């Protein structure tokens, strides 16, 4: 127990039912997140948070490098894997703190500052993720924070991205036996899916002379976002006057760090018939476990080649067609929607950047846990929503930020927490 | 600023946040719609409006013809293309006025009357769209209007089709580079998709003697609705005792005027094996930009033919199978749901029918605009919803129509607007 | 007499002192503006207003043409030329009405609609001046108006663009005798000048083979705004390895209709020395009387040529340098700042578009009129400003527009004018 | 939203309209400033702030050196370049914090103290900029601060330098196409220009014997200030009895660090005629982009030389004449007017000096942004100004400083911020 507003503004307090109209028998839980990330050779890095993620995914750590590129480090998660025990969930509140806790055994460099912003969009949508670039990702003053000393730390508060949302299904494993030992079956978050429609080519003319092994072109590359399962569908129709051409095609899903996270054969070894229409369907389904880090983009590669060939080939074809990437439950707010970036720099190489937080949820147990876990509709307390609405409404005057300098936030935890001690 | 009810009942007033439980940081906007449509040779025509469309599509103009058929004229849209600047949106209120403004340089014919109704369904669902046919599309007296003088004009008011709806994603373009110059990548409205399942045939027997070029049959034709992207999936399995038959199949998407709006090859040039099962998959994905006018139906054509053939063929096969048309975000209310028809007749050929309106939305800026556009949760003012509920509840006693004679509506704009002048 | 708010919201009422802190002995005046513009062959046209212009310039009329170009018609002014009788001035309020009053002797075509917007910028800054393009020039709903019947008309209200502004000096003629009969001497509006700095070229390389008469290139072309006097200054330095090159340069000031409004020789017939630096100064001063229509842009043309020349010239030079266009009193708000466009279309060719309005000012008489005109500081009435501030503050809720459908505006003239009848 | 006083005294709070009489439709924005400056070999440096700068320029960093000279490091700016999105602006409030965040990897030297003052004049007007020299730049006790520990930090608060000021035009780029790729066209801040009139010489006699290449003298050197565009005009008349003398002249604009920031040829290679008057005009126009660091002075150099010459020359001339340097919008308060210096010393070489702040403005969007950005007159709340006046009036008793020890300032953020938490 704790009035929803208390939990909303100070999640470390514990959970409370969200006072909206979504009346479902459920249970409440608090999940911690503790990490001791290590600073890289550059002393700069980036932590990406999914403030409203309806599940155990909290964020991911990337380190910046000499080449100015990022290198995925690891995913930031919940103390326990919710999908393992519950099937449905809803985020009530969340709070996290990035802050350094060490100093290499050979340094006294207070070194370290932090910049943080809350982008109203998906990771791939950011137009600039440099330390200082972040500062202008939003126009909202209460969603930024500049040069906070790393020692002091920063606090990330998760304000609501909408209420009266339904429950999300965690990527819980459904019962299933198979021949393959590594076979996985799960019921994924589907509701409110995101769809990206890509018109790869509209009668695009291709041509290059022969080549042993074939010539390869990257037809397109688009920015998409995904943390959980998605699927590509659609079809590409090819036409050619040439004889004996064998097309090969592969789709790639690239991580935030430029790394290829997933690769699939849309159609390898395909023979093109002169004159007739050559259909090349897409039937991709990428499961969650295969997505080892956030997907920032997708690209299509086509490797054209001919059965014989000399210097005489001048291989050529024409392609028309569009695809449709569908990331399940992608449009459920907070699932991919708001991203909070916490960038640090000048931090002593090797020093630790400690992350600690709490996530509160409304959950529905899986068949097994449901036998010992009682569920109930939320406690009823009038005007709880109105007050929330009022609060949020007057959010900026009240100074309720999403990214706070831990000190300021701490003083707020009395500046409206000096009642019921 | 303007109490939601003021905006709801008089949209020309400006926007206001919807007082529901969907708490999201957003921005408010008003978009105008101005058109000067020209009357055809018949002096009769039809304007189709999508009252609750969550975006820049307001409606479409069709002109009636001698053959008694309609001819699509053009789409009615918002002053600016929202998907270009915002990614998510929600309609707050909308108001439009159809009314004549001219008279050919050789006429003094007051000529012109208007009939209008608000159908609780998709365009294709209308059982009669004739001038007088409309009058009985709904049983609600406050959703009809008969023989309003065209000079006087009519006003279309957009009442809520549900509240607490989430944001819709506009067909905004996602970042992407490709080889084709005319390559398009966008993130479409997906949430609350509409699905039509069509069982094309259940062991349907086909047979006709040979024919040079082949014989062609239209397997089925069904009414579906679509304004934005959709996709057809499924599969048809064929069986045949005959040898060397090559099946060809194409899908058509027809406009409201009978015109073919889109055509795709589901599978052209396919060879049927005697005895074995012959699978014919569907992997269609129709992007929005390709839909030049509302889609009222879909049909499948199969062209069967044999490799040799004389008078000896008696080509025959059997097909089983069902498809599944999915129009993304189709079931989000107002996306396709309520259609308001404004039919006019007896209007002087060549005279202008002027359309003017305002659409108010709650919007979320795209990554670029988000750097100068601040967003906030809606202003909190208690009892705003209740009053709305009350108002709507007592909607018919209060005489709040969706289609008004501009005069009556004008007097209502004082009959409940004579406060705060 | 009339409370400033009465005058502000209903200028046809008469003048009143502005209740700000600019305490100067002055006099009050109302000036009418009556015009009967004639509709062109296209039936479409554009009227440009300078709502806050501190003087006798009200606007200008342009007619659209087949080639889709505009043709300046004439300037819209005050009943009398203020600069002739006063030296200083300040605009208190202004109101204007565009509306058709005729119908060719061979037509009964109600034909005609109007679109109007108030752009927060100079004329040249508009990114689209088409009939429908205007509709999205501002995001403010109360600064647009769509498809108003031309017969009904539109009313342009002039809201304040800032208060506590000083007096502007009218282009009044100063005493002066000269040898030239057409010699003119005046004291212009200077305060708050606008400055445009143009870096024409930074070591720009030029080269083309000989040519009798020379080869001519347009170095640059930029958008600037001016209605009254301006002046170009600066300098271009040239370098050349070639011998005997004679450069010629001219500056053009182009009207809104593409027409050249003014042309001046920055430096015609100039000999370039090989090796040394060749300075080409600008000392232009364009007086008001020479500006026959609003200046939308400026461009520089350089005609290079050689003393001898065959096919052997390969004339070439390099130029570095920037100019500085200074439009006197250009940044005084309303002097060029807000432009209100009133576009009409479908209007019967030959029909009259009547313009009528009133402008109220605070004025200081010239030496001669000052002998019979008594001046006084404004009448003091407490809270006049606050109420104004309050009103303007709550401007959008109150529905106070800058462009109104004359009918609505008329009803407002009671909806807040039903007191003191 | 936030009462102007809250924003004024605690800018990190957000923007609010200034409650003065300058009524203009506008928009409000907060811009951050984050920098991690590095301490030089001397451990001492100087940060120069322009507290009231009406735009994106916040200040500039200089490092002190062994030779006791400063070396410009870089300009301190706003998170985003305002001139890129807005055309007009007005500063509401500003707050900045200089403070160290590191310590070299080989030190434990708390080392570091700060001195800060707010000079009521331009940078070039300071009579002493040494660490301790600053302490006596003002007599106001609340505009100084001595030996604040660098670790603790200092806070720079921006008090009003006048109200009821008009909007300033940002150096926004005006539309323009040219032959040179690096051609730039912009509309600069002009209103309230500063003018320096320099009488270079009044019949100054010059004479020196011949010299190959010529003899060069620096005619004059004066202190002027400029951060944005300026222009030099005027003329020098020369007289000589000698024959065949070719004068060359160049103007230099020197930075705060003694470095030449800009150099221009006023007139290179000029032949002096014996007896007649020899005019040497100035037509300089220095654009903003060329000013890479604040200009602290200007000087004129004249290189006299003769066509022939042996030991026989005794070159001599006489010059009369005065120039007029005009820095556009230079006298708009805060544009150059008050400078706040933050000097640090004894800081560990290599350690970081972190700068962080917020700037709040009232802005007018450029033509493009104006289509999605709504503007409004300021919110009206009575007595807001009076209270301000009262506050400022009693400024010293209340202890409202412009330079605070971050600790004291922090406690003030409760000592008058313990209301509305």
């Amino acid at each position: 127990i704790v009035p929803f507003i208390r939990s909303l503004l100070m999640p470390t307090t514990g959970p409370a039912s969200i006072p909206d109209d979504t009346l479902e028998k459920h249970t409440l839980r608090s999940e911690t997140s503790t990490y001791n990330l290590t600073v890289g050779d550059t002393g700069s890095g980036l932590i990406v948070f999914f403030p409203g993620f309806p599940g155990s995914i909290v964020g991911a750590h990337y380190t910046l490098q000499g080449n100015g590129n990022y290198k995925f480090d690891q995913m930031l998660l919940t103390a326990q894997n919710l999908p393992a025990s519950y099937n449905y969930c809803r985020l009530v509140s969340r709070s996290l703190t990035v802050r350094s806790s060490t100093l290499p055994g050979g340094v006294y460099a207070l070194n370290g500052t932090i910049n943080a912003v809350t982008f109203q969009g998906s990771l791939s949508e950011l137009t600039d993720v440099s330390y200082n670039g972040l500062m202008s990702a939003t126009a909202n003053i209460n969603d930024k924070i500049g040069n906070v000393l790393v020692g002091e730390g920063v606090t990330v508060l998760s304000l609501p991205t909408s209420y009266d949302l339904g429950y999300v299904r965690l990527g819980d494993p459904i019962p299933a036996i198979g021949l393959d030992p590594k076979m996985v079956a799960t019921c994924d978050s589907s509701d409110r899916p995101r769809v990206y429609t890509i018109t790869a080519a509209d009668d695009y003319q291709f041509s290059s002379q022969y080549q042993p092994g074939g010539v390869t072109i990257t037809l397109f590359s688009a920015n998409i976002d995904a943390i959980t399962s998605l699927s590509v569908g659609g079809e590409l129709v090819f036409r050619t006057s040439v004889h004996g051409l064998v097309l090969g095609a592969t789709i790639y899903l690239i991580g935030f760090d430029g790394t290829t996270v997933i690769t699939r054969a849309v159609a390898a070894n395909n023979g093109l018939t002169t004159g007739t229409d050559n259909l090349m369907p897409f039937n991709l389904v990428i499961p969650t476990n295969e997505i080892t880090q956030p997907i920032t983009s997708i690209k299509l590669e086509i490797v054209t080649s001919k059965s014989g060939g000399q210097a005489g080939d001048q291989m050529s074809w024409s392609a028309r067609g569009s695809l449709a990437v569908t990331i399940h439950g992608g449009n459920y707010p907070g699932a991919l929607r708001p991203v909070t970036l916490v960038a640090y720099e000048r931090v002593a190489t090797g020093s630790v950047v400690t992350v600690a937080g709490v996530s509160n949820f409304e959950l529905i147990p899986n068949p097994e846990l449901a036998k010992n876990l009682v569920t109930e509709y939320g406690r009823f307390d009038p005007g709880a929503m109105n007050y929330t609405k009022l609060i949020l409404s007057e959010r900026d005057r009240l100074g309720i930020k999403t990214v706070w300098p831990t000190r300021e936030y701490t003083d707020f935890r009395e500046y409206f927490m000096e009642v019921a001690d």
Side-chain angles (χ1 to χ4, degrees), chain A residues 82-104:
Chain A
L82 296 174
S85 307
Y86 308 86
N87 295 342
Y88 294 93
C89 128
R90 237 168 53 144
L91 181 68
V92 175
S93 55
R94 176 125 60 196
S95 161
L96 293 151
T97 305
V98 179
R99 164 206 200 182
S100 73
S101 57
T102 305
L103 252 170

Side-chain angles (χ1 to χ4, degrees), chain A residues 196 198 218 220-224 230 232 251-254 284 295-300 323 325:
Chain A
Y196 291 101
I198 307 173
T218 300
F220 73 73
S221 171
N223 295 305
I224 64 167
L230 65 154
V232 185
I251 268 178
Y252 299 78
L253 296 178
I254 314 304
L284 293 175
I295 301 303
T296 302
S297 74
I298 185 182
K299 68 177 183 181
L300 179 62
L323 322 175
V325 189

